Design an enzyme around this catalytic site. Structure first.
Site, PDB file in Angstrom:
ATOM      1  N   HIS B  41     142.981   5.036   7.732  1.00  0.00           N
ATOM      2  CA  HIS B  41     142.912   6.109   8.722  1.00  0.00           C
ATOM      3  C   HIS B  41     144.172   6.171   9.627  1.00  0.00           C
ATOM      4  O   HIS B  41     144.284   7.109  10.416  1.00  0.00           O
ATOM      5  CB  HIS B  41     141.606   6.116   9.530  1.00  0.00           C
ATOM      6  CG  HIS B  41     141.406   4.950  10.460  1.00  0.00           C
ATOM      7  ND1 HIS B  41     140.241   4.195  10.425  1.00  0.00           N
ATOM      8  CD2 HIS B  41     142.210   4.465  11.432  1.00  0.00           C
ATOM      9  CE1 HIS B  41     140.374   3.283  11.377  1.00  0.00           C
ATOM     10  NE2 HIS B  41     141.554   3.395  11.996  1.00  0.00           N
ATOM     11  N   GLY B 143     143.191   1.727  19.504  1.00  0.00           N
ATOM     12  CA  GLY B 143     144.415   1.074  19.073  1.00  0.00           C
ATOM     13  C   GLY B 143     144.174  -0.316  18.508  1.00  0.00           C
ATOM     14  O   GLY B 143     145.094  -0.889  17.928  1.00  0.00           O
ATOM     15  N   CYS B 145     142.370  -1.075  15.946  1.00  0.00           N
ATOM     16  CA  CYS B 145     142.183  -1.002  14.495  1.00  0.00           C
ATOM     17  C   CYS B 145     143.285  -1.764  13.773  1.00  0.00           C
ATOM     18  O   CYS B 145     144.430  -1.700  14.186  1.00  0.00           O
ATOM     19  CB  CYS B 145     142.100   0.449  14.015  1.00  0.00           C
ATOM     20  SG  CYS B 145     140.425   1.155  14.055  1.00  0.00           S
TER      21      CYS B 145
HETATM   22  C1  LIG Z   1     139.791   1.189  15.666  1.00  0.00           C
HETATM   23  C2  LIG Z   1     140.669   2.232  16.328  1.00  0.00           C
HETATM   24  O1  LIG Z   1     141.596   1.883  17.050  1.00  0.00           O
HETATM   25  N1  LIG Z   1     140.375   3.569  16.143  1.00  0.00           N
HETATM   26  N2  LIG Z   1     139.403   3.987  15.242  1.00  0.00           N
HETATM   27  C3  LIG Z   1     139.312   5.279  15.311  1.00  0.00           C
HETATM   28  C4  LIG Z   1     138.270   6.010  14.562  1.00  0.00           C
HETATM   29  C5  LIG Z   1     137.539   5.378  13.558  1.00  0.00           C
HETATM   30  C6  LIG Z   1     136.515   6.049  12.910  1.00  0.00           C
HETATM   31  C7  LIG Z   1     136.213   7.354  13.247  1.00  0.00           C
HETATM   32  C8  LIG Z   1     136.952   8.003  14.211  1.00  0.00           C
HETATM   33  C9  LIG Z   1     137.975   7.340  14.869  1.00  0.00           C
HETATM   34  C10 LIG Z   1     140.326   5.922  16.228  1.00  0.00           C
HETATM   35  C11 LIG Z   1     141.286   6.860  15.513  1.00  0.00           C
HETATM   36  C12 LIG Z   1     141.792   7.976  16.167  1.00  0.00           C
HETATM   37  C13 LIG Z   1     142.598   8.884  15.500  1.00  0.00           C
HETATM   38  C14 LIG Z   1     142.924   8.683  14.179  1.00  0.00           C
HETATM   39  C15 LIG Z   1     142.446   7.575  13.521  1.00  0.00           C
HETATM   40  C16 LIG Z   1     141.630   6.668  14.181  1.00  0.00           C
HETATM   41  C17 LIG Z   1     140.924   4.681  16.945  1.00  0.00           C
HETATM   42  C18 LIG Z   1     142.431   4.671  17.079  1.00  0.00           C
HETATM   43  C19 LIG Z   1     143.011   5.114  18.262  1.00  0.00           C
HETATM   44  C20 LIG Z   1     144.386   5.216  18.380  1.00  0.00           C
HETATM   45  C21 LIG Z   1     145.197   4.871  17.326  1.00  0.00           C
HETATM   46  C22 LIG Z   1     144.637   4.408  16.153  1.00  0.00           C
HETATM   47  C23 LIG Z   1     143.264   4.303  16.031  1.00  0.00           C
END
Ligand SMILES: *CC(=O)N1N=C(c2ccccc2)[C@H](c2ccccc2)[C@@H]1c1ccccc1
Ligand SMILES: *CC(=O)N1N=C(c2ccccc2)[C@H](c2ccccc2)[C@@H]1c1ccccc1
EC number: 3.4.19.12
Lengths: 306, 306
Positions: B41, B143, B145
């Site tokens: 993601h 962040g 993740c």
């Molecule tokens: C774990 C993490 O930091 N993040 N996870 C998500 C997430 C996971 C599942 C469904 C929706 C969102 C967040 C995210 C936001 C945008 C794009 C991808 C993931 C969140 C995050 C926040 C900032 C940067 C990376 C990931």
């Protein structure tokens, strides 16, 4: 979201851990620059510990009687001196892994991470509070002496604790890195009174703010209180008296949650008088006092280190 | 003496943490040899997360669209591939700090340490259990993740978890290092049912043995029970059924304490039916299930790592 008892990443401290042996006694030492710091009781046998005269015992030891090993390499000891309850062994090589560091003497109520070691090797890391009675509730077996407590600020490691002993009661005692014990403890095998332990009121309040931030709000009540009124309840339950300095320190958490510090105090007063009624707060069935206001903010903001 | 929720020393894992950016999304990656592993993601925007077609989204990305930074140095991405829910970015340099490692898929009930990271930098370390319902109760902000879970066996790091998401309920979900989710979770912003969580019976029993070893013995009773009798009580309190495999695993703790596993089961049965009556066990007012029998022995023996 989520709230955990988190320790600092231990990498910078692992690179400083060494094994120190003197005679048949082996413990941990901390190698920073060209100096290895360790408990002075490394010079004692089990029998010496009943009533040791450290000055007389140290006079019979020469540089070559101290074996310092970092991993599989032996360091050459070219100087030795006793500073309070710590031995400083000067070695001929500076630690290439010495991080940016400071030695600090923490206040009761403040927290730090412990890297529990055996034979100069790390076994684990956990977060501790310096109790108001200057003891810590750690996990320390024989050979863990010399394990250190520390805090990290970006790239700087502030060492604050060196493990020296377990009291007959099961709690732990030690020194700052200048070898001064926290509390009235001495390095000898004699029964020592730690004294009445009290609850770190400002930390319990900070943890209640961490609970509100994470959605646990059942305990919030329709009451308020005064500092002197709350302190009457605090004295009854062996809680540290709350001062305006503690209220000032909770300012950012109060501004974030919209809950006035004295309103959080009234909620805490009701939890003390009525108990938790089989409920939990952040996964705990008791009031947690091992998180400072600074630990709550750091965790809720995700501040990182080198 | 003393019993603490201890995490493994995180040094070997800190040296593997990198920052991965794709477009405007930044998260953590794990750099082992010439490969950087991270949640797939990273290729999504917040809007893509509602119903992402990962295959179609990844087709619009080239090697140069992935920015990998380890500290202040930029790694050159020469290959990219998606394996289940993880992206593998091939870089032109092998990590000089790559420890000896294995990728493992842990079983529910087993424990591991998490090194919570933000922007490729470590912020803290804590011990977690993989709940029977395949969620973890961590501390993870936006962040985080790409932060990993691991165990250490002397010099070998077994990576078992990569953080992917927080469910609307506040618990956390993620994958093994091959990108397979633990549980029925998918990487999309949709409400997902974790299901009934149950208590890890074998771990609660191991923690009761850790209590006896450390002097907490008030809960020991004059009763015994049978496996089927205890399991009738376990089913009522949402506890995992106890099997002969679990009894076999508790053998060393039973041999050390002199307390038969079925006698410890009867004590646990009485604690479940009557509560703790305002008392504590190893400093806790509830039954702890985040210590495996192997965690209790490791801690009580002081086993060390590289
Ligand atoms: C774990 C993490 O930091 N993040 N996870 C998500 C997430 C996971 C599942 C469904 C929706 C969102 C967040 C995210 C936001 C945008 C794009 C991808 C993931 C969140 C995050 C926040 C900032 C940067 C990376 C990931
Ligand atoms: C902390 C630690 O490992 N050890 N502390 C003592 C100790 C402290 C105070 C009073 C008595 C004993 C143990 C010890 C034993 C013999 C000589 C010095 C200290 C114990 C220990 C065990 C094995 C090696 C070093 C230290």
């Amino acid at each position: 979201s989520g709230f955990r008892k988190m320790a600092f990443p231990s990498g910078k401290v692992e690179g400083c851990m060494v094994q120190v042996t003197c005679g048949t006694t082996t413990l941990n030492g901390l190698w920073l620059d060209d100096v290895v710091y360790c408990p002075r009781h490394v010079i004692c046998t089990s029998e010496d510990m009943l009533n040791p005269n450290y000055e007389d015992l140290l006079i019979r030891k020469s540089n070559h009687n101290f074996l310092v090993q970092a991993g599989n390499v032996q360091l050459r000891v070219i100087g030795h001196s006793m500073q309070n309850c710590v031995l400083k062994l000067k070695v001929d090589t500076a630690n290439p892994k010495t991080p940016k560091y400071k030695f600090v003497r923490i206040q009761p109520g403040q927290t730090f991470s412990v890297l529990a070691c055996y034979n100069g090797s790390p076994s684990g890391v956990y977060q501790c509070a310096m109790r108001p009675n200057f003891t810590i509730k750690g996990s320390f077996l024989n050979g863990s002496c010399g394990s250190v407590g520390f805090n990290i600020d970006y790239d700087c490691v502030s060492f604050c604790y060196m493990h020296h002993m377990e009291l007959p009661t099961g709690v732990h005692a030690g020194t700052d890195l200048e070898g001064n014990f926290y509390g009235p403890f001495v390095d000898r095998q004699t029964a020592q009174a730690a004294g009445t332990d009290t609850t770190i009121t400002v930390n319990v309040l900070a943890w209640l703010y961490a609970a509100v931030i994470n959605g646990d709000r059942w305990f919030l009540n329709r009451f308020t209180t005064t500092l002197n009124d709350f302190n009457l309840v605090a004295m009854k339950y062996n809680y540290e008296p709350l001062t305006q300095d503690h209220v000032d320190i909770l300012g950012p958490l109060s501004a974030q949650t919209g809950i006035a510090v004295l309103d959080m105090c009234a909620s805490l007063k009701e939890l003390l008088q009525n108990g938790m009624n089989g409920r939990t707060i952040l996964g705990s069935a008791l009031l947690e006092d091992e998180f400072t206001p600074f630990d709550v903010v750091r965790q809720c903001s995700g501040v990182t280190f080198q």
